Symmetry: D4
Subunit: 133 residues, 8 copies
């Protein structure tokens, strides 16, 4: 239940945590992993499969090269103590496929190499997510 799932248009600017994609006059700001960003050139058209996240005081967009990745993102968020910034850092470090498998396997060690994930965090994931991927 996200509403905006892809945004396509001319890339106006590429910073290092985000990008602005002009879709019909409206410049949309989506954030993505540096990896995603890299493959993006200003001036050229581009399409991200996005997760949209709404709270009482914000609406942020999150971008990815495919929804199989975006979808995984939404999942990470389903863990108690997983914020967007975080999920984004997790993906910056474990590509979608790379991640899914760590989580099936219960590879704590792997996850632990992520900024902000102690033993306890890593394991809450594997526990709540092992079946789920």
């Amino acid at each position: 239940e996200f509403m905006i799932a892809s945004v396509r248009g001319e890339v106006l600017e590429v910073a290092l945590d985000h990008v602005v994609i002009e879709a019909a006059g409206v410049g949309y700001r989506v954030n993505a992993t540096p990896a995603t960003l890299a493959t993006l050139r200003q001036g050229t058209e581009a399409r991200l499969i996005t997760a949209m996240i709404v709270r009482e005081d914000s609406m942020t967009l999150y971008g990815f090269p495919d929804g199989e990745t975006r979808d995984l993102f939404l999942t990470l968020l389903s863990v108690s103590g997983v914020g967007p910034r975080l999920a984004m850092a997790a993906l910056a470090v474990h590509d979608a496929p790379a991640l899914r498998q760590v989580l099936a396997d219960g590879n704590v060690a792997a996850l632990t190499r992520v900024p902000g994930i102690g033993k306890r965090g890593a394991e809450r994931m594997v526990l709540e997510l092992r079946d789920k991927v």
Copy 2:
């Protein structure tokens, strides 16, 4: 008081609870009954009459082939204990016309064949809705 009542564009993807309709660069994600979905081919343009639903932490879009159906949807929601998922399941099982008449007639038996509706639920509807359809 819904704001977005129809969304028209190229169908980017058709999953089984939803579809993404690109409307001018912006890929919109609407959900609909499998029935609605069926009649939808990727690649081709398409238009859904939508119910838009806003809460503190989400904005979901709900799609239908016509507003006479969409409108009925909004109504189902008007019942205490009727969530979107639910209304959607009710329609998955009773087409708009099929439903309206069950509800006028007070056909509990009929409604009961819906996933998630006991005697008590079915009757809250018929009671609050019998006049209303």
Copy 3:
């Protein structure tokens, strides 16, 4: 501080409390006084100067033929006990110019001819609004 102030496109449907204006694939639903509605034909392009109203559980759009009217609408809302439905009924009965002057003059009698406005209501307006128009 409203965000969306006008919506222009092909009129998809004209009901009696509202209209849907397709603006680039997206069908927007604005509400307006029957008067406004009247001047509107389906099939044809059209532009309303809109008031957009956001709460925790809704976003409604309100349409008018000009912002001098729309702006007055926003004002009505500034009165304690004036809801959108109401402001809309007030305008359905007193055109923008017609209204502004009633309110400057303190013409309670006039306002009283509005559905839902007792002595007390009418006067809260004139009191809080007399200077303001």
Copy 4:
């Protein structure tokens, strides 16, 4: 985490606290410093790098000629007791570059020439922002 970062289209109206920029049928209302406004002619296309601000009961857009300015705006807001109206008045009086440097230098005197900023206010800024610009 702002969502809408630029809006491009035909300028429908230029008032003195804001402007409406039609982006694909949808008239967007952004506010900006008179300075920004000045450089804007009705009838002509135009692009503002915007800050979008969402609360429980509103969504306002704020416009600037560049994001280096817009970005500074977002920052001002990061101070306890700095509202949008305010940040806008601060920029109306100190251009982006002009401001950044006042804040690095700790030039209270300068800031004090802003409507609504006593000693105490000015200093909360310099204190929380001196490093930040």
Copy 5:
């Protein structure tokens, strides 16, 4: 999960929707059905089995001569569209035993004699409560 279930002390005042019971220096204000009230004399000690009701902007106490009645009260409240004032009016008209049985029997007619209960209301109760009493 109510917290305060009885309040015992000298009756300071008996009005017609409520009473103040001083419990150790603190004058507590509980509301009750006129019936309950009747049996109460100022000056004398007294004990009510109370329902305590907390919201974001209030804490009201509701009093009864016994918890078998108080408990029923809490139940009435469990119905969608049953406010405290209401439950209190229902009891003012149907004593606890009298009521329980109407609700088991499904005696709409009976309930209908209550101020504020149409067909539809009465039936929501019987439906959600028939098993429950």
Copy 6:
């Protein structure tokens, strides 16, 4: 629907906006008009008929020598734009009887002598309250 309507005990301290009344070990802090305060000596027992006011982030108690006054207080609060501090200042200046009659009579002039009440304020009262006293 206030909960605590009187508090009786030894006066621990008398400041100029409030007093602490120890009721069984618990020191309660009620606020009152200087007038009320005056008649109060530390060391001695005392009883105030109180209005209790609960919000998401506070619970304040308001004290008076009688509930006919306290009750009027609650009423003042019933006006859009009347805060507790205010109602308290209004009573500091117009005793209960003095006030009730100003409000019946529509004596704006009188009310206007209150700190914080312009023409417009005074009249909102008289309008919403004239019948009510």
Copy 7:
């Protein structure tokens, strides 16, 4: 940060999920494990070390024979997905000492014998709590 940590007085009633303890005229309702309850006779004085739990729409009290137990209760609650009812059921089945040690040892099997705790639940505890007991 609980406020009310013990309540002492005459036991007015002992039901099977709770008890009412009159403390100075005010009948307090605390809930406890059947075990705690057992040791309690109506008519006699009694003291529970309580956890007090406040939300926007309720204030519940939870009772125990000692705070070493009560304190553990508060802890259980510190787990994502642990509600009061739950913590209470956990203690109904594992006395305080019995529990602490299961949690240090990581004895999932043990915890699993609790109503409402699957593998995943049990382990979230042991993970977040193993160090903590």
Copy 8:
């Protein structure tokens, strides 16, 4: 506007961040600086001038040997970024008189010796509080 300003009774337990003071059967839990605590013996009667702090999900009590101290506490809280825990740590380190004067003098150095107060924090205080003490 605090409600509970003192609590007097037999000290049931003295831990190192708090104490429980039984006031008429009800054991109240107040927190205080170790200093305050020290002077407190279990078994004996005792009185703290308290600050009471209410939020949507808690009510905490804060205790001191006098209100001149308690009052200062409330003030600390008036600073953006000053939480209760904090104010308590500040007082644990600077007695009331000691503190007031640091803040008048603008003695950042002094404040800096407090756990959790960088340059920036210390100065927000002195700035917002210098006049205020």
